[PDB]
C-alpha cells in the first residue's frame, strides 16, 4: 500500500537507486466571496501576453500559464481551499489555461466580490 | 526582470511551447522549539529501512528518503519555515539522507522539545 517506486540501475558493478515518482494532477473547484474592502488573499503570477498563446502546451508539471504564487493563510482563498502553486484553469466560466496575465486579472476584477474558479494542483 | 523559461519546439510545422524551468534547490536550516504537549506539527514520510540504504542516489527530483508529507499550518514547523515536500538532510546535526524511516523518527523523538533540521525545497 504505502510504497514508493524506485529505479535500480546497475552497470559495470556500479549501482544507483533513484526515485522516479509521477506527477499527480488534482483538479478542484473554488468559490470565493469577499467583502468590498478585503482581498481574495492571493498573488497571481503568469506570462504576459496580449492574446492567448495558442501553441502553449500543458504538461503534467505545468498545466497552465497563470498560477498562485502565494495564498494568504486563513484569507478568503485559503478558506475556499486554494493553495500556493495552484494552476488557474477557468475563471468565471472562461477558460484561461492559455490566457495572458492582464486578461485573467481583468476577468477576476469584473467579478467583483465573487470569484469562481477551476484550478489544478500538481505534486510529485 | 520577472520571467519563466519556456521551450519552443517545432517539427513538421507543428509547434509546442512548454515550460522548461531549471530546478531550484534551496537548502535551509529549521529550528523547532515546541512545548511539552504540542507536537512539532508535521507528518514525516519515507522509505523504511533497518539500516541505511547506501546505494541510494540523490537526484534533483528526489534528494532524500524522508520528506515532509504534510505540515500543519500555524503549527511549530510551519512557523519555522518548513513546508510540505521538504526533504530532510540532517536531523539534529546527523545526516539522514539515506536513513530508514524508523531511525529518523527516533532521532527526532530523542531531541525532546527541540528539533534542528536541515532540509531542501525543490521547486521548478
Amino acid at each position: 500500500r504505502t510504497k514508493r517506486l524506485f529505479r535500480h540501475y546497475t552497470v559495470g558493478s556500479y549501482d544507483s537507486l533513484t526515485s522516479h515518482s509521477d506527477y499527480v494532477i488534482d483538479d478542484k473547484v473554488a468559490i470565493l466571496q469577499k467583502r468590498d474592502h478585503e482581498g481574495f488573499g492571493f498573488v497571481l503570477r503568469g506570462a504576459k501576453a496580449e492574446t492567448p498563446i495558442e501553441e502553449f502546451t500543458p504538461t503534467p508539471a505545468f498545466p497552465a500559464l497563470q498560477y498562485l504564487e502565494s495564498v494568504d493563510v486563513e484569507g478568503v482563498a485559503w478558506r475556499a481551499g486554494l493553495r500556493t502553486g495552484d494552476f488557474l484553469i477557468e475563471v468565471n466560466g472562461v477558460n484561461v489555461v492559455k490566457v495572458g496575465h492582464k486578461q485573467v486579472v481583468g476577468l477576476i476584477r469584473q467579478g467583483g466580490n465573487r470569484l469562481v474558479m477551476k484550478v489544478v494542483s500538481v505534486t510529485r | 526582470r520577472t520571467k519563466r523559461l519556456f521551450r519552443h519546439y517545432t517539427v513538421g510545422s507543428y509547434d509546442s511551447l512548454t515550460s522548461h524551468s531549471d530546478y531550484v534547490i534551496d537548502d535551509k536550516v529549521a529550528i523547532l522549539q515546541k512545548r511539552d504537549h504540542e507536537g512539532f506539527g508535521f507528518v514525516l514520510r519515507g522509505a523504511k529501512a533497518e539500516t541505511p540504504i547506501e546505494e541510494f542516489t540523490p537526484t534533483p527530483a528526489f534528494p532524500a528518503l524522508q520528506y515532509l508529507e504534510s505540515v500543519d499550518v500555524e503549527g511549530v514547523a510551519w512557523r519555522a519555515g518548513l513546508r510540505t515536500g521538504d526533504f530532510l538532510i540532517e536531523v539534529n546535526g546527523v545526516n539522514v539522507v539515506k536513513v530508514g524511516h524508523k531511525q529518523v523518527v527516533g532521532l527526532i523523538r530523542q531531541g525532546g522539545n527541540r528539533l534542528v533540521m536541515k532540509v531542501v525545497s525543490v521547486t521548478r
Binding site: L44, H101, V105 | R4, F6, Y9, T10, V11
Partner: peptide, 15 residues
C-alpha cells in the same frame, strides 16, 4: 525542426 529556449516575461498581481 528546431528546439529553442526562451524567457517569457511574467507578471505578479495581488488580488
Amino acid at each position: 525542426a528546431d528546439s529553442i529556449e526562451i524567457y517569457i516575461p511574467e507578471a505578479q498581481t495581488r488580488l
